[PDB]
């Protein structure tokens, strides 16, 4: 019984201290994926962790949106559970107390978990250990589904139950067990693949 989670390649350099502490657990298996999203970790097939900075939340982008709008919205497109971890400083806490409830209402969503942490790395490590204990799972044409944008943990769970043909058959016949593993966009992407004519 060894659980497994993923780390985004673009975020490995920052979370190196977190990775060192998490991997001291002998049962944890850590794989790295060049996932396009901004999430720091992937917990299971449809759960991710995205760490953001409270003082950056109200930073205006050039297109008028806030700093984290596009990144959070792209995570909701691909994950059924998005865990948002907000690092806040004592400086921004004493200066702007209104920001803390504004963020929880701004990000308020039945698919978004929001937890505030101090800036120290130990807080993020202890939240990760809690996420791994609760959500992480235990554990071939994987490249077809990876090129569809599916995460490595999702393609692992798929091939735990199906071959690539059987998974298409289940998706074609709209079997809920295969369907309830994907989001809406992931389902319509797999249908577009199965419906384009040659």
């Amino acid at each position: 019984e060894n659980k497994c989670i993923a780390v985004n390649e673009n975020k490995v350099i920052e979370n190196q201290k977190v990775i060192q502490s998490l991997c001291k657990n002998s049962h944890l298996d850590l794989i790295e994926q060049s996932y396009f999203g901004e999430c720091d970790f992937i917990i299971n097939h449809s759960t991710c962790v995205y760490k953001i900075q409270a003082s950056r939340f109200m930073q205006l982008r050039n297109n008028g949106s806030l700093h984290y709008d596009k990144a959070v919205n792209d995570l909701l497109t691909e994950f059924q559970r998005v865990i948002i971890i907000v690092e806040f400083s004592e400086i921004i806490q004493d200066v702007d107390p209104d920001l803390f409830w504004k963020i929880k209402l701004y990000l308020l969503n039945s698919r978004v978990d929001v937890f505030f942490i101090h800036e120290t790395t130990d807080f993020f490590i202890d939240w990760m250990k809690y996420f791994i204990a609760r959500w992480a799972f235990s554990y071939a044409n994987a490249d077809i589904l990876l090129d569809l944008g599916f995460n490595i943990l999702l393609v692992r769970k798929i091939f735990q139950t199906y071959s690539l043909e059987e998974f298409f058959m289940a998706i074609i016949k709209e079997e809920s067990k295969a369907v309830k593993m994907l989001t809406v966009s992931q389902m319509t992407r797999l249908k577009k693949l199965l419906t384009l004519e040659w």
């Binding site: 396009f36 109200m58 008028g64 949106s65 806030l66 709008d69 959070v72 919205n73 792209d74 909701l76 497109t77 806040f88 806490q93 107390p97 209104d98 803390f100 409830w101 504004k102 929880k104 209402l105 701004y106 308020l108 969503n109 039945s110 929001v114 937890f115 505030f116 942490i117 101090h118 807080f123 809690y130 044409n141 077809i144 090129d147 569809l148 944008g149 690539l164 043909e165 059987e166 298409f168 058959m169 074609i172 989001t183 809406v184 966009s185 319509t188 992407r189 577009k192 693949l193 199965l194 419906t195 384009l196 004519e197 040659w198």
Partner: protein, 189 residues
Amino acid sequence: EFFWDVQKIQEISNVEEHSVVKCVTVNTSRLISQLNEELQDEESGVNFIVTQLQLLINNVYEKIQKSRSLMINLNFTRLKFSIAYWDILLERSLDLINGPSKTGARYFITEVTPVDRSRYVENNQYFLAFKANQRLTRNSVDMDEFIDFEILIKQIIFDLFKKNGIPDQDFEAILSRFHNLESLVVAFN
């Protein structure tokens, strides 16, 4: 033994279309005082708050039963400790709780401020614009332009022919009977 003072509860509308947000103003002066005087040591104080949080969560959810997705804002009058510790103690309390309150609703802790939160939801430009943004994200097709479906379909075809032992001569006839992978996969299954 109940150290929470539950005050007015109000539903804050238009926060998120697919959820009902109820804000529960709670007075913490009684619990804060007991922490300073009754439980001087840290270990006893942590269990005191966690056991009290389970009392507050069950009693607040109970008032809403007889009153989408239920989001319950526990709006404390004073947060003596940092909110980072409150988010930890709230998860610890919910983990220990077995029953309808943990499963039936989602809870988040905030501190009472003089700012009207019902106005910000209905007036703020960036709050409104993001709620409209994430309303269109569930059915987003933005990633598809990077994906080359023709190359993937060509690989699935060749693998399928390779697994069924189909020779190259049968390619033209088979691909003329079945026009997409949906028909092709069910034909060989």
